[PDB]
């Protein structure tokens, strides 16, 4: 994308420069330099074709780079990811026959704007009262990453179906990837052969474990997880599953089986779940009145959820309060007065090399020019553990 | 609509075309109530249903459970 | 929960059982005594040394 | 062509008036 | 919590997520000229003084902008010099249509006949948008209002 | 003969399609 531009390509600039250069070529014999004068039709006619040709002439190098990235290493053109959750359906009474919830059963939230559909048919055996099945969001986007017990409204009524809810908070809602993320995805394919020096970082965080997970590779870290005792020939992996929690032992087994034929013979691979540090924010800000208080709060919450994405966070790295304030201000329409994280205004260091931050609570105190104080509090995580 | 004695063949046909829909829906249905003989009254589901021998099938086959 | 349930506890009894669909059917689950043929009668067994 | 297409309506129409009159 | 793993040799969880580098030839700048007109469909002319690709396109193909095909049929950089007496291959007009390869593509919607050729011939055939159906043209203009970003 | 039988049939068809669109 950041490719040098071979020639100037702009309609108005082409017209102006063409008139000036026509003046220059003659020894001042052509003086109608008015870019909107009587020579505007001729110059504009030439400049239309000139721009429509130079615009494509400027694309040569980027076309070559795109062709290289597409043909010799086919890379899929990522479009997005749909959020997934686990719905539990509960019956009104114990049936003598086996209840069936059909495929593509639509559930929604209270507002009715977010809609999920069941993955497959759910068969609740006769005598049971509840049954669980996975559901996928209607469309891509981070707006479908809802909390637990949020999706409970359903339109089509089934016989004896009493309730339905989501047991897990829906996650992995992604609207797509930027150009830099696609570039990084292409480059990792260029350099991942024989994972050495924290390419284990890259082989699991987005591969062989799902999209939306995290890994942290630490060399010479034994079973004691003590840095001051290095063990040569040991690589320790710390994993956060696709759901954003410390990795399930089944996922640990899967990643171990995946990585076993790729590590050096004689070396020892250790895999353990990652750890999370909960971040609680208190924001006192002055509003410019260009947005409503609810709109400001929603924008700030969405920006912080983007900031504290485990894909955007490096495990073991301290959280910088200036960076958080910049992420908040990038929303716009507000002026930050004060920000507290974990009951202090200082940077928050991670307890160890393998701890990922995870912001959980945020309190808003927004003051406008007229003087109204809007106070609100949002809890983002299900509970302090998950 | 009102098809009189001054109508053409094409309109006579068109009238039949639109008005035969109800007769089409009636195909493979049971329009009138029937009289039948109860042959089974022991309902395993306890729903007080009975089985009948309707004259349409000539007692050759059994019918479905019929609700009270 | 028992205290709350006892408030709206009825006294009527149901002869049928719920089912999801009208087409679906379920079989019987209990073997109920219907009538008493004989309070005390003599009986013998056949098929043994016969 | 259209003349005869029409003549044909006139024929079919009158033929089907004949049938109406031909029947009890 | 921790799971001690030793080195192995061949596992299927690794085959599941294994090969990444895929050498597929897809539509790109370096695959526009894959298709080649058959040698039996060309004429083998000689370069003589006063000749240009515009003239060859006009006399043989009837269109001045058809020269892109001729150059694409010869691997010639037009801005480079063609030596006097050098041989060139000019496509026939009526024999240009048999370079259009038709094959059946499968889709979840249904079978579709698809034309394949070098992109120059594709542009020349679809000149004036005569071949494409009006529904396609209307489809691409359905989204007139285009989202732009403001700084 | 068969040519005209077909023509007449087609005339009738277009007169029936006409009647479909002639009546409300």
E113 Cβ contact partners less than 8 Å away, ≥ 6 residues apart: E102, E103, E104, E105
| B13 and chain F in contact, CB less than 8 A | yes
| Whether the Cβ atoms of residue A48 and residue A18 lie closer than 8 Å to each other | no
Per the structure block, which two tokens stand in for C1? 């929960």
Chains F and E touch (3+ CB pairs under 8 A): no
Separation between Cα atoms, residue B43 and residue C28, nearest integer Å: 9
Residue B13: its H or E element: helix B9-19
Chains that touch C (3 or more CB pairs under 8 A): A, B
What is the greatest pairwise CA distance in chain B? 63
Separation between Cα atoms, residue A325 and residue A285, nearest integer Å: 11
Resolution, Å (one decimal): 3.4
Are the beta carbons of F16 and B13 separated by less than 8 Å? yes
Residue A326: its H or E element: helix A321-329
DSSP result, E35-64: ----GGGEE--B--TT--HHHHHHHHHS-G
| C22 and chain B in contact, CB less than 8 A | no
A67 Cβ contact partners less than 8 Å away, ≥ 6 residues apart: E28, E29, E30, E31
| Whether the Cβ atoms of residue A116 and residue A79 lie closer than 8 Å to each other | no
Chains A and F touch (3+ CB pairs under 8 A): no
Nearest to A152 by CA among A107, A117, A186: A107
Separation between Cα atoms, residue A44 and residue A50, nearest integer Å: 9
Nearest CA in chain F to B1: F24
Nearest to A74 by CA among E24, E141, B21: E24
Nearest to E76 by CA among E33, E114, E133, E115: E33
> CB B14: neighbour CB atoms within 10 A?
19
Nearest to A259 by CA among A182, A198, A195: A195
| Whether the Cβ atoms of residue A205 and residue A214 lie closer than 8 Å to each other | yes
* DSSP-derived 3-state class of residue C45: coil
φ/ψ of A84, rounded to 5, equals -130, 145
| Whether the Cβ atoms of residue A185 and residue A75 lie closer than 8 Å to each other | yes
Are the beta carbons of C17 and B46 separated by less than 8 Å? yes
Task: List chain C residues with CB under 8 Å of B48.
Answer: 15
Nearest CA in chain A to C18: A95
Separation between Cα atoms, residue E60 and residue E70, nearest integer Å: 10
What is the greatest pairwise CA distance in chain F? 36
Task: Name every residue in D having a CB less than 8 A away from some CB of F.
Answer: 4-5, 8-9, 12
Among the partner residues E5, E8, E17, nearest to A207 by beta-carbon distance: E17
Per the structure block, which two tokens stand in for A367? 């003051």
Deposited experimental method: cryo-EM
Local structure of residue A190 (DSSP, 8 states): H
Separation between Cα atoms, residue B30 and residue B34, nearest integer Å: 9
Per the structure block, which two tokens stand in for C44? 């013998």
> CB C1: neighbour CB atoms within 10 A?
5
Per the structure block, which two tokens stand in for E115? 């034309």
Nearest to E8 by CA among A198, A268, A330: A268
Local structure of residue A207 (DSSP, 8 states): S
* DSSP-derived 3-state class of residue A374: strand
Q: Give strand pairing partners of B51.
A: B40
Task: List chain F residues with CB under 8 Å of D8.
Answer: 8, 11-12, 15
């Amino acid at each position: 994308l950041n490719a040098p531009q071979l020639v100037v390509d702009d309609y108005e600039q082409l017209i102006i420069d063409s008139l000036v250069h026509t003046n220059v070529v003659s020894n001042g014999e052509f003086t109608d330099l008015d870019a909107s004068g009587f020579m505007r039709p001729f110059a504009g006619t030439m400049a239309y074709a000139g721009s429509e040709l130079l615009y494509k002439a400027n694309l040569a190098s980027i076309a070559a780079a795109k062709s290289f990235f597409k043909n010799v290493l086919g890379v899929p053109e990522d479009t997005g990811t749909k959020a997934t959750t686990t719905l539990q359906f509960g019956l009104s009474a114990s049936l003598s026959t086996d209840f069936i919830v059909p495929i593509n059963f639509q559930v929604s939230d209270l507002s009715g704007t977010l809609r999920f559909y069941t993955i497959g048919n759910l068969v609740i055996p006769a005598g049971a009262t509840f049954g669980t099945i996975e559901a996928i969001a209607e469309d891509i986007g981070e707006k479908y990453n809802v909390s637990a017990n949020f999706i409970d409204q359903y339109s089509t009524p089934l016989t004896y179906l009493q309730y339905v809810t989501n047991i897990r908070p829906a996650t992995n809602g992604r609207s797509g990837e930027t150009i830099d993320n696609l570039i990084e995805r292409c480059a990792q394919i260029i350099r991942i052969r024989n994972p050495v020096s924290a390419l284990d970082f890259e082989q699991l965080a987005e591969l062989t474990m799902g999209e939306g997970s995290r890994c942290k590779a630490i060399g010479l870290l034994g079973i004691n997880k003590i840095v001051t005792d290095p063990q040569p020939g040991v690589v320790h992996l710390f994993l956060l599953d696709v759901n954003g929690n410390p990795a399930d032992p089944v996922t640990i087994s899967t990643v171990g089986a995946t990585l076993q034929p790729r590590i050096m013979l004689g070396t020892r691979l250790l895999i353990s779940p990652m750890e999370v540090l909960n971040i609680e924010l208190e924001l006192i800000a002055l509003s410019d009145s260009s947005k409503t208080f609810q709109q400001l709060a929603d924008d700030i919450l969405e920006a912080l959820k983007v900031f504290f994405n485990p894909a955007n966070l490096t495990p073991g790295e301290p959280v910088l309060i200036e960076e958080v304030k910049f992420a908040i201000r990038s929303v716009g329409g507000l002026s930050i007065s004060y920000l507290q994280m974990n009951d202090n205004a200082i940077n928050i260091p991670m307890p160890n090399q393998w701890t990922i931050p995870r912001f959980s609570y945020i309190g808003f105190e927004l003051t406008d020019s007229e003087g109204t104080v809007y106070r609100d509090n949002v809890v983002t995580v299900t509970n302090p553990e998950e | 609509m009102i098809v009189d004695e001054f109508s053409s063949v094409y309109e006579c046909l068109l009238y039949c075309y639109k008005m035969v829909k109800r007769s089409e829906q009636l195909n493979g249905r049971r329009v009138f109530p029937i009289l039948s003989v109860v042959t089974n009254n022991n309902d395993p589901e306890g729903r007080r249903r009975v089985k009948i021998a309707d004259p349409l099938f000539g007692n050759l086959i059994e019918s479905n459970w019929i609700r009270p | 929960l028992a205290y709350y349930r006892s408030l709206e506890a009825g006294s009527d009894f149901q002869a049928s059982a719920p089912k999801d669909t009208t087409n679906n059917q379920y079989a019987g689950k209990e073997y109920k005594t219907i009538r008493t043929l004989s309070n005390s009668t003599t009986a013998s067994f056949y098929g043994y040394n016969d | 062509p259209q003349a005869i297409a029409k003549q044909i309506a006139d024929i079919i129409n009158s033929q089907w008036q004949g049938t109406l009159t031909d029947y009890a | 919590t921790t799971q001690e793993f030793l080195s192995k040799n061949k596992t299927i969880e690794s085959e599941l997520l294994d090969l990444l580098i895929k050498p597929n030839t897809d539509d790109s700048i370096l695959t526009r000229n894959k298709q080649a007109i058959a040698d039996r469909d060309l004429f083998d002319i000689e370069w003589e003084p006063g000749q240009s690709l515009n003239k060859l396109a006009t006399e043989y193909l009837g269109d001045s902008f058809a020269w892109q095909i001729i150059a694409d049929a010869n691997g010639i950089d037009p801005t480079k010099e063609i030596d006097i007496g050098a041989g060139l291959k000019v496509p026939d007009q009526k024999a240009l249509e048999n370079s259009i390869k038709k094959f059946i593509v499968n889709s979840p919607t249904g079978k579709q006949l698809i034309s394949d050729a070098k992109q120059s011939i594709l542009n020349l055939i679809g000149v004036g948008d005569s071949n494409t159906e009006f529904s396609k043209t209307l489809k691409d203009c359905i989204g007139k209002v285009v989202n732009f970003s403001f700084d």
